[PDB]
């Protein structure tokens, strides 16, 4: 057996066809095994709505997840990504740097 704790990368991006857009983003890189759960949160509660959850692997024990959605910032919100994994014995929580 293998396991290994995701790393969690959290960040924005606008499209370069359509820069008015603006997508949060949350890459959980390089863990195992696959079973996992990923959360984007606004001010600590979870954002029910994200468009896009993309799944892939490396090598046969190393596993990628982008999950982002459109969102509309302000200075006074914080966002963040709350992951769940067997390496993990508390939920981690990744929060958002507004300059990213």
Known sequence: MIQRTPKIQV?????????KSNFLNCYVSGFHPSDIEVDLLKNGERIEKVEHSDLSFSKDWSFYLLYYTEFTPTEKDE??????????????IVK???DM
């Open 96 to 98: 958002w740097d507004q």
């Open 79 to 92: 966002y963040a990504c709350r992951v769940n994994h067997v390496t993990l014995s508390q939920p981690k």
């Open 11 to 19: 960040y924005s991006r606008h499209p370069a066809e359509n820069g």
